[PDB]
Amino acid sequence: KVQTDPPSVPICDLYPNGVFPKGQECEYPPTQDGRTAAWRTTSEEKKALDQASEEIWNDFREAAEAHRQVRKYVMSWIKPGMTMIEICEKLEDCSRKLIKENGLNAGLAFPTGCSLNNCAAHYTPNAGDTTVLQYDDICKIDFGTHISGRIIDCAFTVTFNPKYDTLLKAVKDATNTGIKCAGIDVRLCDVGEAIQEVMESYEVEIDGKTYQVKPIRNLNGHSIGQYRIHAGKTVPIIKGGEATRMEEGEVYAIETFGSTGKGVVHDDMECSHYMKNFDVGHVPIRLPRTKHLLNVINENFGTLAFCRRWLDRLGESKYLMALKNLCDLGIVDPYPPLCDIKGSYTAQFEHTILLRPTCKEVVSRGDDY
Ligand SMILES: CC(C)SCC[C@@H](N)[C@H](O)C(=O)NNC(=O)c1cccc(Cl)c1
Ligand SMILES: [Mn+2]
Ligand SMILES: [Mn+2]
Where is the protein situated, by its record's location annotation? Predict the structure, then answer.
């Protein structure tokens, strides 16, 4: 029936009918030649094409509902004083529960990002990380869930000091702007131009210093594929970023990043995130430790991203060199933390959208953001 205070009932059991709640459904934005959408949500052939992938949309929805319930839960207890490990463990414990983890059929799409301050993304603690969340920290919670490879890439920013309020509002508004501009036949470079205009319309004051929010130029949104967090197309966030168009049936992660620094990220700190190259095929390996690790990765993650903590929990130890080998062989790719200049502040907001035949669905939309 209903769920417990501390989320523990799988989303699957909350909807015995196998039909999960849809996200925010929107009519596609007008074009300039009668190519709007007040006809799509209406067309008969479109309703057919759409209904044809109902099971797919349904898998995204089950993953999205798990995501909404997990983040609402996280927002109630995340507090300075907790270690980053404690935060990720508690979040992941709940995510595995509500998504009813079942090997590669259902589970966590990628590691729990909890990047701090100047670091914008790809940071999650490795074993032994003693980092503690602080009152003045600006933490980006970015985690994912999936059902049959249908990934929900969604994220928000956590703060405790009201001095970052306008900064968060700026990035949230920017992301929502990107979501509204998105649609079938829309040029990706136009979405980025739109996002940047809104983002830069915000000026903020933090600790006596004023800044015009800058989008992080080398970070962006992206299309999503089955078991493929990045399908190939990128949603810029600034301006001149390719006029390729979005297509019907595509799924996108509309994510924007705002910064008070240079607006550019670079690799920094110890790497924790890793993911098999989607285009690399079977590779025979004789090296004992390297062979075993690759098998563990194929069995547990496939082409989904993972982190060192997830290797530890599987009972693996002294796998670092084997992991480096796979990376050097190009079988696996490392994704180190991406950070702006020291002293800068970065914020993020992200949603997954479905470019359905009849409409645009912000499947991960919630009452929170
Ligand atoms: C580092 C990822 C493999 S783990 C997933 C992180 C996402 N939550 C984040 O929003 C994101 O999209 N990060 N960037 C990438 O995943 C990325 C960048 C360039 C090339 C490829 Cl294949 C993936
Ligand atoms: Mn993300
Ligand atoms: Mn993303």
Answer: Cytoplasm
